[PDB]
Amino acid sequence: KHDYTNPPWNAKVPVQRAMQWMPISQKAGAAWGVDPQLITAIIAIQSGGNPNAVSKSNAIGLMQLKASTSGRDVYRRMGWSGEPTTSELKNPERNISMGAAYLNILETGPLAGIEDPKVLQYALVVSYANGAGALLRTFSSDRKKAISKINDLDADEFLEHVARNHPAPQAPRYIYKLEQALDAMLEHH
Template sequence: MKKAWLAVASCLLTVSCSSPSAPDCIYNCSPSTSVGNNNLNGNNNHIVLTEAQRLALFKYLENQVKKQWGDDDYLQAGKHRYVKYFDGYRTRAHIDFDNGKIYVSTVANYAPQATLKKAIEETLLMPADPSQVDLFSDKSIPLKGKPFLLGQVKDHQNQNIQWPWRASKYADYLIANKLKTKKLQQGTAYYVEINMVDDHLEQREYQYADLIRQAAKRYDIDEDLIYAIVKTESSFNPYAVSHAGAYGLMQVIPKTAGADVFNLVKNKPGIPTKEYLFDPANNIDTGTAYFYILKNRYLKEVKHPTTKHYSMISAYNGGTGGVLATFDSDRKQAMDDLNQLQPNQVYWALTNKHPKAEARRYLEKVLNFQKEFKTM
């Protein structure tokens, strides 16, 4: 039934995404004259950050937050965690997707309850399109379009929160009845804790069902695999980010997987911006297109379909190089060894002998999730 409703790892795609200097286009190869936010020839409103700029952005955010909250209470966004700061970094919203909890807090000295109310309202009504929200600054959130949390949170009257007036009333209720305080290094934090509905994960899955269905059909990749990857990578959190520079639902890194998809699949120059990858449609398309590349280019010599399936999943996390290094240091010999083994032997090797411990756990986790989605 879940399937009917339905669509970083720190080393995500960092090994497997190298490609020849002049790669052959392998899908939909007509040059595109309109690439939206990814037109890198002068019509782009967004900037592609260099690695140094990206790291500097994270460091700046960390410094600003620690000035207000102290070292012990520094918190930043992650793959399964949304964190957004407001009001000179004195106020923050934190959504723990794994545990279904929302925390809105402030260390503001002046009018903390009014500050907290505004932050609660912005959190409850934040847009479903993450490209509209700047996670790396204290800018306010534009409250337009369908709220991302619609259906994932109920107010004190057990109603969905779609409009500003209802968000305002619920914020008043929370501050009047649920306000808590906590002593910090730098003063006192005022906060409220909001429980998400029991099926909040299914609510998010439902939001992306059409996008996953379309991408699966477009690239001939199983829907349940895409669902399993999204659940593993982000718990269906479209705001997901990682220190490795991965963005969005499928945790795509622009300069590796993103570049491969642009060059090999889309026939576009350059790499996608973070705004492009924060868009759920673009992110799911790009992540699924990368599976197409793994299947038809990097791992095309793998003969057994089940072995190829295992190898693709492992390569999405630890790279094609990591998959081959599990079997031999020489890539050609590794491919020969891989093809001589039975799928269960390949699975054992990838979950016990892969050079990276995270990749060993990743394959097992994705396959377990895939079974869940296949039977729903």
């Protein structure tokens, strides 16, 4: 019921720009067990493939990591102290390595137990940008119960649930933008 396809998003240039980094995304995806096409879609959607992108809240670089949030999570998972600096997050190789780690952190953490890889992919794009917590709580206040209910859905039912029930209108739009980006990636071989 969110009008999430409006306005139409043309993925062509954002993905063309995100694809410049694909040699890195291939290696980061291999290192973290993460799909390089999901990494590429998230670069296209979050930064437009601009390695110097900086958000209003100082999310930095191709995969829009915030030093005091996503960067801290990447440092904690790695057993490192403190948080990355702005300069480290601007480096395309390190930015993408950290975004891939954050995707692994979401997959192996809050979203652990999701069975269908396509449902997991939709869950990750919505969680990356809007929070794994907010998404899970649309299903249930018990995480374990939310994963159970998600595992009873196919990808189309998952999207339909997010479109009808997610408080954030951008949540279902991330899934739409992901599909536009996967379509545009079909033109790159």
